[PDB]
Structures are given as structure tokens and as C-alpha cells.
Amino acid sequence: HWGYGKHNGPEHWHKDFPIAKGERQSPVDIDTHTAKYDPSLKPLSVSYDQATSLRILNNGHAFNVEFDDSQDKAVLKGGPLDGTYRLIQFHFHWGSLDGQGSEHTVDKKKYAAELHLVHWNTKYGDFGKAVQQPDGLAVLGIFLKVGSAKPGLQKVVDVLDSIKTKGKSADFTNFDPRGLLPESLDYWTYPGSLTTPPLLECVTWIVLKEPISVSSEQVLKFRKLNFNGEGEPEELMVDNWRPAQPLKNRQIKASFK
Numbered sequence: 001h002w003g004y005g006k007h008n009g010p011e012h013w014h015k016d017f018p019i020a021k022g023e024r025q026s027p028v029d030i031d032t033h034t035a036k037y038d039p040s041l042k043p044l045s046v047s048y049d050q051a052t053s054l055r056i057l058n059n060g061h062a063f064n065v066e067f068d069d070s071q072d073k074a075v076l077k078g079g080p081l082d083g084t085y086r087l088i089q090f091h092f093h094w095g096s097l098d099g100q101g102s103e104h105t106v107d108k109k110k111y112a113a114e115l116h117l118v119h120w121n122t123k124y125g126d127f128g129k130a131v132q133q134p135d136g137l138a139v140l141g142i143f144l145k146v147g148s149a150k151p152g153l154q155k156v157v158d159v160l161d162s163i164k165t166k167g168k169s170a171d172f173t174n175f176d177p178r179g180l181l182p183e184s185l186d187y188w189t190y191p192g193s194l195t196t197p198p199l200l201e202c203v204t205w206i207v208l209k210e211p212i213s214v215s216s217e218q219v220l221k222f223r224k225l226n227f228n229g230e231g232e233p234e235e236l237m238v239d240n241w242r243p244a245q246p247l248k249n250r251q252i253k254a255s256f257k
């Protein structure tokens with residue numbers, strides 16, 4: 001099964017998922033100088049006031065905080081998007097060291113981690129149908145750098161001991177994802193893919209310019225999770241990031257100058 005180890009990591013994924021060598025794969029390096037400012041890009045609309053988190057799950061490749069997406073409770077609109085996209089889950093990718101961990105890079109710079117808030121286009125009715133469409137998902141990507149703590153992340157950090165191993169889930173209600181957002185919603189955007197198998201080319205990527213800062217203790221607790229299931233040999237869940245993929249025939253647009 002695919003993973004991030006020596007024999008099943010990202011360079012192996014194309015054998016099971018040939019779209020890995022596709023024309024709109026993610027993540028990518030964001031060359032800030034080559035990104036073009038687009039004045040027709042609208043500001044992003046993040047409407048998270050009514051979000052209903054339900055639980056948190058270790059799926060063996062990251063942990064997902066899952067939301068009730070059966071109504072327009074937490075939605076993303078505006079920006080490059082047409083229509084309304086509902087938040088279904090968020091998760092992170094992170095490194096074994098503070099110097100790596102993000103999937104997107106900015107002028108080749110790697111951040112300590114990257115948060116992905118995953119949304120699906122309501123015109124397709126549910127997530128499973130949306131991922132089959134070229135405009136099915138909008139993923140809001142937010143970089144994490146190590147510095148001061150992010151208070152809004154602590155409730156996530158504190159529950160991770162209850163989902164250490166693959167397959168464990170925990171009730172995780174009343175979590176407000178607004179506590180994970182930076183001050184500015186300036187963004188880059190490009191058409192891309194899921195960054196884990198099945199690598200489907202269904203994502204409008206919206207990557208925020210401004211990182212959030214989290215503490216060293218906060219990211220250290222991510223690194224205590226396990227890829228393995230309980231009662232299997234312990235392999236720390238670290239470096240669960242795919243490296244940058246060829247931009248090919250794509251242009252990254254910026255909402256700011």
C-alpha cells in the first residue's frame with residue numbers, strides 16, 4: 001500500500017496511480033516572481049461561523065478533523081471559485097524537522113507544515129461525486145512556520161494522544177477552524193490535484209501567502225503520531241508530504257501584488 005517510506009513513497013505512487021505523472025499534479029513550487037497578479041480575482045469568502053466539527057481520525061497518512069457537510073455550515077466562496085464549496089475535513093502535512101514538511105513551496109522555501117482545508121463544490125451533491133470533476137474541490141492551503149504558539153491549534157494538539165495509531169478516531173466537536181487562519185487572505189491559485197492517492201485532478205488550489213506560526217511544542221506533538229496501527233511496529237508519522245511536481249502548462253495567479 002502507498003505511503004511515505006522508502007519503498008512506497010511518492011516516487012512509487014505512479015505504479016498504482018498513473019495520474020501521478022499527469023498534467024495538473026500538486027503540490028508545486030510557487031515562484032512568486034512568475035505568479036501573475038490577476039485583478040479580476042475576488043477576495044476569498046470564508047464563512048466558518050456555523051462549522052460543526054464531528055470527530056478526528058488517524059487514517060494512516062495524516063489526521064483528519066471532519067465536519068458535518070450535509071448543509072452549508074462552513075463554506076468557501078469567492079476568490080477564483082464559482083459557486084459554493086463546503087468544508088468536509090482539514091488535515092496537515094509535516095516534517096521530521098522544522099526545515100521541511102510543507103507540500104507547496106514558495107520560491108523553493110519549505111515550511112514546517114501545511115494545513116489543507118478541504119471543500120467540495122455543492123453543485124455535485126457530495127464529496128465522492130465532486131472528486132470526479134475538474135472543478136470538484138477547493139483546498140485552502142495554509143503554511144505553518146515554527147515560532148509563537150497558535151492558541152486555536154491547541155485543542156487539536158491535545159487530542160492527538162487519543163488517536164496515536166492508524167484507524168483510531170475521537171469525538172471532536174465544537175472545534176472552530178477560524179482559529180487556524182492568518183490575518184490576511186491574500187492567496188495564490190492554480191488548478192491541481194489531490195496530493196495523496198488517488199491523486200485526482202479535481203482541485204482548485206488556493207494557497208495563502210501568510211503563514212501561521214505554531215510553537216515547536218505544537219509541531220513536536222504531530223511527530224508523535226504513528227503511521228502504523230496499534231500493535232504493529234511503531235513508525236512515526238513524519239514527512240507525510242509529497243514534493244513539488246512539474247508545473248507543466250499552468251499559470252499560478254496571485255490575488256495581490
Ligand SMILES: NS(=O)(=O)c1ccc(O)c(NC(=O)NCCc2ccccn2)c1
Binds near residue numbers: 116118131196197203
Ligand atoms: N492533501 S489534499 O490534496 O488536500 C487531499 C484532499 C482530499 C483528499 O480526499 C485527499 N486524498 C485522500 O484523502 N485519499 C485517501 C481517501 C480518498 C480521497 C479521495 C478519493 C478516494 N479516497 C487529498
Ligand SMILES: [Zn+2]
Binds near residue numbers: 091092093116195
Ligand atoms: Zn493534504
